[PDB]
Amino acid sequence: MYTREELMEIVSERVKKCTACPLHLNRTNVVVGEGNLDTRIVFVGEGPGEEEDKTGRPFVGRAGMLLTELLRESGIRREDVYICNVVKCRPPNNRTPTPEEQAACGHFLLAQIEIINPDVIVALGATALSFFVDGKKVSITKVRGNPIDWLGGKKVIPTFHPSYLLRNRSNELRRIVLEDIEKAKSFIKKE
Ligand code: SF4
Structure with missing residues (x-):
């Protein structure tokens, strides 16, 4: 009847046409999201930076590159999960x-x-x-670090934004984030 792919595309089309807020006047390209539509774990950020806006892709900037590494250091491939943000349009400056x-x-x-x-x-x-x-x-x-009970029993694990580790490069800080990511993985339901 319908595929996940098709629904995400509808979301995509409606976003490109959205003008709900002031942010539509600024962005060059909307940044919907990317990844495996069947992942058990989703990563959500704030919104588009300069590279995202230019490529129409999420987390491609310096912060994104860092996130890729955190994922790699958590035994996770980008291609295996899904990545998105709260807002789809890049704010001015x-x-x-x-x-x-x-x-x-x-x-x-x-x-x-x-x-x-x-x-x-x-x-x-x-x-x-x-x-x-x-x-x-x-x-x-x-x-x-503290799990939050959200809709449908889904669990949300809040942690720092990659952008923060770009600024503060201490290892303790990176360890905490990774610890939080491991935490989320523990909530993926066993097979
Ligand atoms: S940020 Fe979201 S609500 Fe605002 S114009 Fe863009 S797609 Fe629409």
Whole structure:
């Protein structure tokens, strides 16, 4: 009747046509997401940076390159999971997306998660965090590492955004993130 591929494409087409928030006026290309539509684990960030915007792909910038390594160091191949963000359009001067802008785009993420139906989601960053606590304010630093019960029994593991490890290069910091990723993997349901 219908395939996951087709539904994601519909999401994709509606995004390219979206003008729901101010961010549509700035971006060069929308960044929907990429990966395995059958992964049991999804990674979600904040939004498009300069490279993402140019390639229309997620996490291709320096932060993305770093994320690739964290995944590799967690026994994970990019091609095996799915990667996306809370907002699809790049804000001017890469400023942080406004909560309003965040609220307007969210329905897309929801559909994506709906289509993939994963066992666990990793929230990279505070923005990714807000989305899973209903926009509410929460300190990424205080909650990182603690599993959150989300819809359909799915678990969300919040952790730091790769962008942070670009800034602070301490090994302790990298170890914590990896620890959090391992944590999420433990929630993937055994075969
Ligand atoms: S950021 Fe999202 S809600 Fe705003 S114009 Fe882009 S696709 Fe639409």
